[PDB]
């Protein structure tokens, strides 16, 4: 049920999330893991930016799947 979060530089972390978790909750978990304000995080999966109100099951976030993260005003 864990997933991987990768930036554009290849640096990855492992986040244990739930299929019924909203992307805002995933960003809050990211903030808990690494210090990163949730309002300045873009999550990309399948080429589409993740919405802050949609759950992970809607994007088909399978187990051991990679999500690109890019911080606003940092590199994207």
């Amino acid at each position: 049920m864990q997933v991987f979060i990768k930036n554009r530089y290849g640096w990855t972390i492992t986040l244990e999330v739930s299929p019924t978790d909203t992307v805002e909750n995933v960003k809050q978990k990211i903030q808990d893991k690494e210090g990163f304000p949730p309002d300045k995080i873009r999550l990309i999966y399948g080429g589409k930016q993740m919405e802050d109100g949609r759950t992970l099951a809607d994007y088909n976030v399978q187990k051991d799947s990679t999500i690109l993260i890019c911080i606003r005003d940092v590199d994207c």
Binding site: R8, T12, T14, D58, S65
Partner: protein, 986 residues
Amino acid sequence: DAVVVTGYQTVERRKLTAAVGKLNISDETIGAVKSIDQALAGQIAGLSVTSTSGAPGAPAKIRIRGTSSLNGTQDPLWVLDGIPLEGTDVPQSNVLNDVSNIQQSSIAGLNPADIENITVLKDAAATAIYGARAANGVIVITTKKGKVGKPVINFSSKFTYMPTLSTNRLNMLNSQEKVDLELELLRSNFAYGDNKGGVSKIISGYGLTDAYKKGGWSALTPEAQTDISRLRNTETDWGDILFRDAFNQEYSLSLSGGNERVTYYTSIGYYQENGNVKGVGLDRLNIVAKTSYKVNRMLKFGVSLFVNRRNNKTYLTDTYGLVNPVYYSRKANPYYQPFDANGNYVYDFDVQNNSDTDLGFNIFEERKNTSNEETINALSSIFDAELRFNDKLKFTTQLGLQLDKASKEQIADKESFSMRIIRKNSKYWDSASQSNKYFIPDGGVHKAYENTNSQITWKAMGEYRDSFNDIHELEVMVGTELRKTWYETLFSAGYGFDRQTLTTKPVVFPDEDRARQFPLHQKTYKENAYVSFFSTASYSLMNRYTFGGSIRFDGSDLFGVDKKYRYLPLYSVSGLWRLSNEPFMQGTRKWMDNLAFRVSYGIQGNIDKNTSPFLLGKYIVDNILPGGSEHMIDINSAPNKKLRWEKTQSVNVGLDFSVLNQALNLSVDYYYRKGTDLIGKQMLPLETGFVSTNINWASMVNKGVEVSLSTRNVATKNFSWYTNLNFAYNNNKVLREAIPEAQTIPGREGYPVDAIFAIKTAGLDEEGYPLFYDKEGKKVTLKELYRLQDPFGLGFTVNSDVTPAEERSFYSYIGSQDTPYTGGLINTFSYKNWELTANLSFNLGGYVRTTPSYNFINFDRGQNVNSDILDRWTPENTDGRLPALITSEKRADEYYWYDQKSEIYKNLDIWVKKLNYFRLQNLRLGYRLPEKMTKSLGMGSASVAIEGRNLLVFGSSYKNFLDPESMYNPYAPPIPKSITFSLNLN
């Protein structure tokens, strides 16, 4: 073998209209196994046994005539002396690091030395008397009992040597070529894991990272060169400090006997077994006490009592197996030594599947600081009473009490990787100080699990057997059964735990959400009750035409209340025609003693215990009006008043053929089983109030053929040779199933329940990237296949217009995980007092999706690799067949599409391997001591035997893996080899 037991009644072989497989349990047939589920591999046609793991006590996944359900029960039903057993269900999950902590089936508590034979009921004609527990087949255990006469005293002692696990089949890089690979990666611009690996740490420690990248080997100071050369020449054996050879010991004492009124049986057994992984072991103490008294010429009362105690000791691992020693032998660096010159611990900081170096792992520290122990106390009492009312009328009653209590204790000390990763996972964002803190205290963790599984069964049936005109025979049984099951679990966790002081520390969770991933107290309770009324009828005419039938009305609290589905019958009809008894065949009785054609049709059922017929909800405190705070219920699971057992309609045609006085026995069996009303998630219309629900809608079909050949090749006063070949082909096909609209993997409709869909590749192009086939069949890249577009040009802002429906057309069907062709071949030779038994078992026709040896993007170079990474494409080695380690500088869009879509690389057809293996399950050579020597020793009998288990497996190539069954899950030990010396005394 003139009778067949079905758990309810005894059926004569001449009146058996069903498909029944019987295996006589003995030393000369099954060998020196310790669980019955492991002794059934290849000895019964149509019964496929697959080892889920090689660890001691690991349950075996058993399938009778394929998979009969999608989301419900998939394991067969075990019956012990008429009382069905609970806890015999294998709870398997997708988690690869779940088989390390796997529940033990209650079947592991039964001594194979206390079991006379095993009866497997395969078709509807044999299983429909079990009602809604018959879809997956039934295995009936008959236990030994006292024979009228003097007491029989059998003492058995087995001493087993388990050879050490050799990692030479893993094909891992040693220090030299791994350091070469790390230097090669440091020269290149590989994005992932630049800080990991010994070479990278050594080079960055002296600051010559860019200097090395620009200048090669000559750009390093003599000190760095000496350090790297020391790394190259350092060798560590990770197969001898992780694995071991073992000496297991089993003892058994079976005292029995009886006389004209009372028959008694007693047995005490004790075995100790060790795993190939250090610190893994399992012992079992078993007691059996049975006594059957004949109160009158009518009444007969018997009591059987099986008491069992198992003790398992094993390792504690991360939730996702970053510590597993079986996987660590595949992962530990070759030049990494866990001890320095002073004997202190050296920590491996590259154990995480991340770029993080925060957590260190030492195998000896984990072994001496962590523990995972478990004790299972089991009891099974069966009280049976029989009343011979009349010469034709008989009444039987039976009460079976089963109780299994498993207590597990997992302790992780403060200085262990388990506690380190738990504490790291407990990191939260304190907004008061705007900093990342940890709420799990400083100390260890003690976790206690207590699972109780209880069952009470009460059967009461009556048999009437009559004979009319010496040519008609009628047998009618009518009975009822009330069963009740309870399953309770308690979990208690304590953090800050000190092992010596037994004292914990308080935990302050940031909120309730973080208090559910670190639970301190959990309780679960589940109680079910079943009421069934069954009947069987049989009519035999002229000793050639048998007609049989079975009806069963089953009810439970797991089914809906709706009256139209309340009590529907689960029935079966059957017919047997013995051609050998026909007058026109009277001229062929000199060379044939059996030709029987049997036909069977029936309706079986399955129970899904996870679904409930009730409205399941949760409490919330939301409001409708201001100042109108209220307590309202949100529906989690919709009520289903039409819940019912999963129907399975089956037809079967069988043939029995015996020639030359039991010299050649042939049993062919063709079966077609279409299962409808299977429970699964259907996308319901929105007019039902719910988007989707688990209802009785899905369907599948299993069709195949079983062949059982049994020949007596040589029959001489001294030499004798017997052969027994069992073969079974099964075709599974899911006919109706719902997949999410966003899923990109093809559905299983029209394919087995386990189909493997892989993207077929045409090879690699001139830059090492994999090539794909489009609809027209020409080799295209990922850009052309997915029509990748980059509007922003940032590289990682890739998008594709390919819909999931179109994406599902990229994958192709390869095969199935379970092999359609299963069976075995057993050869028994006897010469004077010597006996030899060669048991082989074949599983052919399978496929398995192996984990890729390396990821072209996420390749972690802080961990050891296979030798096939040297077979990858590189600028110097342009003839490599495996994909090159790609970077984002050359094709940014393809790189960042392979990145965020990690399933494309794993689902390539190059990681799918065939599964066709023949395993020598048993090679036993026995010797019966001469009667004169035994009598001189004052013993009725004496025997010795040398036994080899899993000594040889061949067939399809299984490269880079320790066993053909270990090609899927790398976290489970392979099936161990064993050499057993057995001594038996009477």
